[PDB]
Nucleic acid binder design. Structure first.
Ligand SMILES: [Mg+2]
Ligand SMILES: [Mg+2]
Ligand SMILES: [Mg+2]
Ligand SMILES: [Mg+2]
Ligand SMILES: [Mg+2]
Length: 117
RNA sequence: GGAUUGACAGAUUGAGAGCUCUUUCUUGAUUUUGUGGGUGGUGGUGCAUGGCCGUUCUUAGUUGGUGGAGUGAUUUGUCUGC
């Protein structure tokens, strides 16, 4: 669901849980750190997503949200001083949640559903 | 899918300075390059200034209010004496 994802990105931006990028994400997944991972499939040459999946096999669950630019936009990378987007382009293309922070019921039901697959 | 940061070892250096290079590794939006602007300056101007001190001047010297003399600038009061 769309709500739980923004909730978890807020709970990990507040307590510094987002591994904003792929090297930090890879290091977190290699360690016992990365508790969640959202990545976009609209990536050229597709090897980064394959590497993310392989590191995920190894901290298991992953999400497959598209729209890398939008993913970064609602991932909190923007300073977003105004109400509207005040930056030309900003993206993440991989986001890893380390610290779960505050917990909401809808989000935990969603992650349990995604774990069940 | 890296604005950037930092560095072992060597060349380089006076340096055990990752200053610069060889290679690579680390770091995460604080930054980096341009514009405006701002700071810092035992930089200049004491002949732009303050404050302070020095000196004229260690002497006894100044000043204005009513009043008098001058058209007036000024003067008397601030003096002949002791
Ligand atoms: Mg100075
Ligand atoms: Mg002077
Ligand atoms: Mg005097
Ligand atoms: Mg008179
Ligand atoms: Mg007189």
């Amino acid at each position: 669901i769309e709500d739980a994802l923004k909730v978890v990105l807020r709970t990990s931006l507040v307590h510094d849980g987002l591994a904003r990028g792929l090297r930090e994400s890879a290091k977190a997944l290699t360690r016992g750190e990365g508790q969640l991972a959202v990545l976009v499939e609209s990536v050229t040459e597709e090897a980064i997503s394959k590497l993310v999946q392989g590191l995920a096999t190894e901290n298991v669950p992953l999400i497959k949200v598209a729209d890398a630019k939008q993913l970064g936009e609602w991932a909190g990378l923007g300073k977003i001083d105004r109400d509207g987007n005040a930056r030309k382009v900003v993206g993440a293309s991989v986001v890893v949640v380390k610290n779960w922070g505050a917990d909401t019921q809808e989000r935990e039901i969603l992650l349990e559903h995604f774990s069940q697959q």
